[PDB]
Amino acid sequence: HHWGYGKHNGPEHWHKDFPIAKGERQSPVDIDTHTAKYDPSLKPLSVSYDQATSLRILNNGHAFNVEFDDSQDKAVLKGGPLDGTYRLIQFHFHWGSLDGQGSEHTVDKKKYAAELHLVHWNTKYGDFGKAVQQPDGLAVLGIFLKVGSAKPGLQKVVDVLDSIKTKGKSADFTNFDPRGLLPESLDYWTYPGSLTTPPLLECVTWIVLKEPISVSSEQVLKFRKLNFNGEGEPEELMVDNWRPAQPLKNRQIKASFK
Ligand SMILES: CCCCNC(=O)c1ccc(S(N)(=O)=O)cc1
Numbered sequence: 523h524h525w526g527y528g529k530h531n532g533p534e535h536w537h538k539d540f541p542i543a544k545g546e547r548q549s550p551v552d553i554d555t556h557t558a559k560y561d562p563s564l565k566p567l568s569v570s571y572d573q574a575t576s577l578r579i580l581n582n583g584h585a586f587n588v589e590f591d592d593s594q595d596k597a598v599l600k601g602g603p604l605d606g607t608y609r610l611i612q613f614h615f616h617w618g619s620l621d622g623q624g625s626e627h628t629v630d631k632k633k634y635a636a637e638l639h640l641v642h643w644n645t646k647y648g649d650f651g652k653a654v655q656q657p658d659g660l661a662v663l664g665i666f667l668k669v670g671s672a673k674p675g676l677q678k679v680v681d682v683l684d685s686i687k688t689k690g691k692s693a694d695f696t697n698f699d700p701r702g703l704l705p706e707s708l709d710y711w712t713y714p715g716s717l718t719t720p721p722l723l724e725c726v727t728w729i730v731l732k733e734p735i736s737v738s739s740e741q742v743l744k745f746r747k748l749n750f751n752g753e754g755e756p757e758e759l760m761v762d763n764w765r766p767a768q769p770l771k772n773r774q775i776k777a778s779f780k
Pocket residue numbers: 639641654662716717718719720721
């Protein structure tokens with residue numbers, strides 16, 4: 523009863539209620555590494571999460587979000603292609619029904635099993651709801667997950683998923699340190715794009731890390747046991763909650779590394 527990922531309300535249908543779906547700066551995209559241009563003027567990213575204050579985890583019927591206190595300049599992203607300071611508000615993942623699909627961005631048409639999105643908003647706009655109406659309002663740090671060794675820093679998220687199995691369940695989720703979800707390198711590609719879910723607003727500077735993190739098959743299985751439906755309703759497993767690659771059109775993807 524609204525948009526989703528099924529055959530009847532999935533990404534190919536979104537344009538009917540969100541005509542920006544066919545706009546000029548939609549996300550995600552395929553990152554063609556033979557075409558992305560190294561840009562030695564790009565600055566190093568500064569990811570400052572030491573004071574991050576997580577609050578809550580919520581199943582919103584499309585994914586689960588871990589939300590942070592963003593009332594002050596605690597956990598912020600600066601530098602790289604960005605001007606000024608972007609505050610962390612929430613992170614979530616997109617993932618597949620099988621290990622060979624699930625990421626939203628692709629790298630040379632390669633799909634990863636999942637992708638983490640750490641969502642931040644530009645403090646010059648005062649609040650998140652103002653920021654999404656601006657073309658430089660958000661910065662989303664995207665990180666690929668490949669199936670491999672377990673990620674210790676993810677285990678606290680995987681352990682709480684039982685408690686938010688269905689749409690509209692939430693649980694207290696404090697003292698969670700998002701630093702534990704970062705790879706070793708912060709090398710990245712960057713391009714101007716959009717939210718990858720309705721309302722698909724064209725307000726995001728994408729920063730996509732080159733190095734994936736590794737998660738175990740038991741960890742990603744736990745994501746796949748979540749439900750899109752609410753309690754009581756017919757069970758629909760929360761899998762394949764990814765939007766496919768959208769045309770790059772007149773954009774250039776920049777690499778921070780050569
Ligand atoms: C008004 C916005 C309400 C829907 N909300 C979002 O806040 C949103 C944030 C990040 C993404 S994503 N997947 O591109 O990181 C998509 C959507």
